[PDB]
């Protein structure tokens, strides 16, 4: 078998998961109407192998297979974050901390802008359809959740938009549903870069004609960085190239000047209008709900051209209850940028993480107690400093509760987090509300209350650092097996376990 | 005959053996740390309970240790089966069914204990008078690093009786060996051990309260010992109702208290509230040993002991979830919490204290039809709820009451945490109670200034959407079992193996 590069090539990503027994090719006919979604949910929820649906009801030979759960969790024996690790070309057993720290290290690497390759060598140019041959309604697009507002073709593809001055090309994920034979609609909302760039087209009189590309089965490093809140003005492609150690190979679109990854499974091209809008949503989302007939108009994308590979594969995320990509990518790439912001701001933080169990609503900051102690501060002042750094930023947008814990908590393990949360904060008294900051409109407690009108508040910083940890050493015993007892005793017990009779 | 694990501690051990849920460790184990460490490993992976048959320093009779008598075990055998066996219930009975059974038992005729012959009573097999009491000779475990001492009393039953003899209380409260004749332990309000002790102090007998301390009692008894049943009600009579028969008892050597005839060990003597000794710290239900944070507690003077051949000390070693301080303490508060909701007219279907929340969170499953009939608001309902629970003994340990609608399975922490984070606005949906009694054991209380006031720091958290207070609100829960029509869910489960899943 060839040497696999799953960060660079979507199909190598598929092969590496086969070789790890982490992918199940389903060859029997599966209905894109709910059945795909339901299988994906069953697989996410027990951390099982990713399904590749090779035989979809209503598919042509090329359009398409579906890959579900591309960044779901899997058994610990294989490395439970192996799928995320493979998007970055890392050892499958890498921890999430290491994943995060690698993304931060790649920020100081030389950015490698994309490299144009010949069209004759680019798999995404194998088939080219011009406008009259665009028939979105004939694609076997999944209907992912009951009461979704339409069929969501765009759950794990990359939108490419570029500023008018050509200086900033943004790659990002935002949901899109098929509206009719030629149109997609989806979220283009503040403070997302896709809206920022669309607005820069509006600012010069071209709100009804913004060029885009939508690419599926891009280099897995590209799709991951597509979900990451990197800074404005920074073209994702260049940071992808630093992650990969090589420039992303690209080709020009058929109908505009945008560059698309040469190994994409499927490329859609066209223009976006902010002034022609269509009812969109609802969509089963990151917090675990479909709220019925709660759609709202969004912009229309007119598809004008398409290109694709033989036997093309559509990667799909089907969000809901933890754990899926809206938790493993959205949350952790937020936590990555929250750590960066801590470094920028000088907060005494070791790590950051968004527990999956908290539906990417909670941001846990692991506080370096010595560094905290060096500030000579109080919980009230420190919680204010922290909330003020995070809750007015794009990075802090999805976050409604920042939880501060000492450096004895493994924040990446929710058994330790929930322990620290309930045992170390006094309800209400240890929580600081932030009334005036922008609410995340998707939080169900926000959207299903009068706060959906006012758009402000409902966020807090929760102090789970004991008062004495603001001042000095505080040595207590954590009462479990591994931490509670001397290393000699833990080993002795572990060595003799079978001999005792445990079977 | 038939084993009766509810009535006999040794039948309880036998049915755990019969289910491969008990490991008899026959090599030498040190009660210094090693027992407690083995126990922690067992609890934390829901493994078979250890029976330590050969403790360093033990005599032939005093003693073996059974750890984890109410720990959780594999779902295959019934994960709550140890608790079900304390009540003589099917081992696969769920904790909801356990709770509802305890509530049913409240309607049965109470059966007070019946005296049986001393000659037949196992707990009278060996009898020691005062001079032969040597508590330092017992292989008492040192359960956690930095414990204040060796806690003999973690899963036994204190017996105190009011001076007028109308109420005999059975309860568990920790106790450590002080010296060769004395134990010290918690005796705090609002617990009944303290309430009864105070009634003795009011008539000039604070320094001479009769007590008995019993180990390896009838498991139904040790379970009700951890339950906050009403004041004035003798546990023995409800334990009777649970068993379908009177607990068999015998009189103490040195006082008038009645002890279970099948007890493994009985210690007797006098409690003094006014002779105190440094007690603790102890690794307790919230998961911490706070080093050198002991406090003065009453002294128990042991004047007599009796015991069986080959006696067994049952032991609980608390800490991170899950152990008896969560499965018994929490669930038994929940049981009385549900009973209180019924008596107070709240529309509560079920109550539970998730193990993950270290018995600090009480979840109340609200009947939405009942809530809607109230025509109330969240603010009013949260007040009503906190007022009912936080001002009474049953609410003592609980710092946060979480209200959820009837679509949440409160026995499943995946649904509870999902509902918690998604359905309440941080701070705005929380109502603080400032003037209620704090649980002194909560680490956020003990390690703050609130340790000096003992007031406040409790809250009710509203996880019921605003619309659910008024009318129907049909939304889709985005998971496999709830999100999809039943026919599809069944179809996927039937075809799973054929897809290629293994
Ligand atoms: C991984 C992932 C990220 C989604 C996402 C999903 C996934 C799988 C979906 C498709 C399943 C459902 C909803 N999503 C949207 C989304 N951002 C957004 O504006 N609208 C969305 O609809 N995000 C987040 C978005 O990709 C991140 O906020 C990026 O930081 C945005 O890029 P930018 O920083 O360049 O604006
Ligand atoms: C099961 C159980 C219950 C403990 C307990 C433990 C266990 C295993 C320990 C021994 C491992 C550690 C600490 N415990 C104490 C405790 N109550 C108390 O006042 N002091 C305690 O030290 N409890 C709770 C007590 O048993 C319940 O609150 C009962 O409601 C008390 O009975 P009462 O209502 O008759 O007063
Ligand atoms: K991005
Ligand atoms: K009791
Ligand atoms: Mn961007
Ligand atoms: Mn009582």
Author numbering:
A (entry chain A): 1 to 503
B (entry chain B): 2 to 503
Task: Tell me what the authors wrote about this structure, in their words.
Prenylated FMN consists of an FMN molecule modified by the addition of a fourth non-aromatic ring joined via N5–C1′ and C6–C3′ linkages between the flavin and prenyl moieties. Following binding of prFMNreduced and formation of holo-UbiD, the cofactor undergoes oxidation to form the catalytically relevant oxidized prFMN species.
E285D exhibits minimal disruption to the active-site architecture, with hydrogen-bonding distances remaining very similar to those of wildtype and prFMN lacking modification on the C1′. For E285D kcatapp has been measured as 0.28 ± 0.01 s−1, and Kmapp has been measured as 20.4 ± 3.6 μm. Movement of residue 282 during the catalytic cycle of Fdc1 could therefore facilitate the shuttling of protons between solvent and the active site. Both the E282Q (A. niger) and E285Q (S. cerevisiae) variants are inactive, whereas E282D and E285D variants retain a considerable level of decarboxylase activity. Furthermore, the pH dependence of the reaction for both Glu → Asp variants is similar to that observed for the WT.
